[PDB]
Design an enzyme around this catalytic site. Structure first.
Site, PDB file in Angstrom:
ATOM      1  N   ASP A  60       4.394  -6.402  -9.045  1.00  0.00           N
ATOM      2  CA  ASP A  60       5.007  -5.098  -7.933  1.00  0.00           C
ATOM      3  C   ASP A  60       6.314  -4.762  -8.680  1.00  0.00           C
ATOM      4  OD1 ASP A  60       6.871  -3.974  -6.229  1.00  0.00           O
ATOM      5  OD2 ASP A  60       6.771  -5.515  -4.419  1.00  0.00           O
ATOM      6  N   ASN A  97       0.766  -1.101  -0.195  1.00  0.00           N
ATOM      7  CA  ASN A  97      -0.160  -0.308  -0.187  1.00  0.00           C
ATOM      8  C   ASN A  97       0.685   1.466  -0.238  1.00  0.00           C
ATOM      9  OD1 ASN A  97      -2.039   2.683   2.241  1.00  0.00           O
ATOM     10  ND2 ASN A  97      -2.760   1.716   0.207  1.00  0.00           N
ATOM     11  N   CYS A 107       3.080   1.798  -3.177  1.00  0.00           N
ATOM     12  CA  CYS A 107       2.653   1.775  -4.944  1.00  0.00           C
ATOM     13  C   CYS A 107       1.607   1.663  -5.628  1.00  0.00           C
ATOM     14  CB  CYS A 107       4.029   1.252  -4.749  1.00  0.00           C
ATOM     15  SG  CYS A 107       4.205   1.639  -7.014  1.00  0.00           S
ATOM     16  N   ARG A 108       1.579   0.531  -5.922  1.00  0.00           N
ATOM     17  CA  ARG A 108       0.525  -0.106  -6.718  1.00  0.00           C
ATOM     18  C   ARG A 108      -0.891   0.423  -6.644  1.00  0.00           C
ATOM     19  NH1 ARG A 108       1.730  -6.001  -7.031  1.00  0.00           N
ATOM     20  NH2 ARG A 108       2.392  -5.206  -5.022  1.00  0.00           N
ATOM     21  N   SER A 109      -1.914   0.113  -4.955  1.00  0.00           N
ATOM     22  CA  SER A 109      -3.077   0.706  -4.972  1.00  0.00           C
ATOM     23  C   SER A 109      -2.871   2.133  -4.645  1.00  0.00           C
ATOM     24  CB  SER A 109      -2.919  -0.506  -4.001  1.00  0.00           C
ATOM     25  OG  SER A 109      -2.769  -0.191  -2.687  1.00  0.00           O
TER      26      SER A 109
HETATM   27  O1  LIG Z   1       5.428  -2.725  -1.003  1.00  0.00           O
HETATM   28  C1  LIG Z   1       5.793  -2.901  -1.567  1.00  0.00           C
HETATM   29  N1  LIG Z   1       6.556  -4.169  -2.282  1.00  0.00           N
HETATM   30  C2  LIG Z   1       7.077  -4.985  -1.554  1.00  0.00           C
HETATM   31  C3  LIG Z   1       8.311  -5.585  -1.626  1.00  0.00           C
HETATM   32  C4  LIG Z   1       9.735  -5.965  -0.834  1.00  0.00           C
HETATM   33  C5  LIG Z   1       9.265  -5.807   0.416  1.00  0.00           C
HETATM   34  C6  LIG Z   1       7.828  -5.095   0.870  1.00  0.00           C
HETATM   35  C7  LIG Z   1       6.491  -4.811   0.139  1.00  0.00           C
HETATM   36  C8  LIG Z   1       5.222  -2.361  -3.292  1.00  0.00           C
HETATM   37  C9  LIG Z   1       6.215  -1.907  -3.716  1.00  0.00           C
HETATM   38  C10 LIG Z   1       6.351  -1.582  -5.642  1.00  0.00           C
HETATM   39  C11 LIG Z   1       6.851  -0.180  -5.734  1.00  0.00           C
HETATM   40  C12 LIG Z   1       7.846   0.633  -4.028  1.00  0.00           C
HETATM   41  C13 LIG Z   1       7.319   0.283  -3.178  1.00  0.00           C
HETATM   42  C14 LIG Z   1       6.716  -0.689  -2.626  1.00  0.00           C
HETATM   43  S1  LIG Z   1       3.861  -1.700  -3.567  1.00  0.00           S
HETATM   44  O2  LIG Z   1       2.451  -3.380  -2.968  1.00  0.00           O
HETATM   45  O3  LIG Z   1       3.397  -1.763  -4.570  1.00  0.00           O
HETATM   46  O4  LIG Z   1       3.208  -0.991  -2.078  1.00  0.00           O
END
Ligand SMILES: O=C(Nc1ccccc1)[C@H](c1ccccc1)S(=O)(=O)O
Length: 154
Positions: free
Chosen positions: A126, A12, A14-16
């Site tokens: 992701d 929560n 990036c994507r969402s």
């Molecule tokens: O939390 C994430 N991944 C994640 C990867 C490794 C460990 C924990 C979380 C995802 C993210 C993508 C890009 C930049 C930051 C976060 S998200 O699900 O889209 O928010």
């Protein structure tokens, strides 16, 4: 009757929150933001309390879409209050279904956001370990899926 949608990803940050901001802009642009409750949450507790990842902010700034959020994890109540819970990948989907089966009231229809993509790119991957272009792809998917979802919910 107010409609509601919760976008969900792993952290929560990036994507969402991107999907949430894209969707909120869409409804605001069409004069119907007051008819919608829009939010985003995480399957995990990895990032609770944190703002959207700045790599996502950079992308959103390029497209002129403001974004602000504080990461939170999905809760039992979310299944009762939301009409739609739209998530990013199959892992998110399996976790949400698992959690939904632990509560009495599941009003929410739980689906992949990508199931709305006219271009059929089902999974919104992701981009954490990816590059700028991966964030851009996520953004474009969110635009296409959010537009289709607004036009006609499943
Ligand atoms: O939390 C994430 N991944 C994640 C990867 C490794 C460990 C924990 C979380 C995802 C993210 C993508 C890009 C930049 C930051 C976060 S998200 O699900 O889209 O928010």
């Amino acid at each position: 009757a107010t409609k509601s949608v919760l976008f969900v990803c792993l952290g929560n940050i990036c994507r969402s929150p991107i999907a949430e901001a894209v969707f909120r802009k869409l409804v605001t642009d069409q004069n119907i933001s007051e008819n919608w409750r829009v939010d985003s949450a995480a399957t995990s507790g990895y990032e609770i309390g944190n703002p959207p990842d700045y790599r996502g902010q950079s992308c959103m700034k390029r497209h002129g879409i403001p974004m602000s959020h504080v990461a939170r994890q999905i809760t039992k109540e979310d299944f009762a209050t939301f009409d739609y819970i739209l998530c990013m990948d199959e892992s998110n989907l399996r976790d949400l279904n698992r959690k939904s089966n632990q509560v009495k009231t599941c009003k929410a229809k739980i689906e992949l956001l990508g199931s709305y993509d006219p271009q059929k790119q089902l999974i919104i991957e992701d981009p954490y370990y990816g590059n700028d272009s991966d964030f851009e792809t996520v953004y474009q998917q969110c635009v296409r899926c959010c537009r289709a979802f607004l036009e006609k919910a499943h």
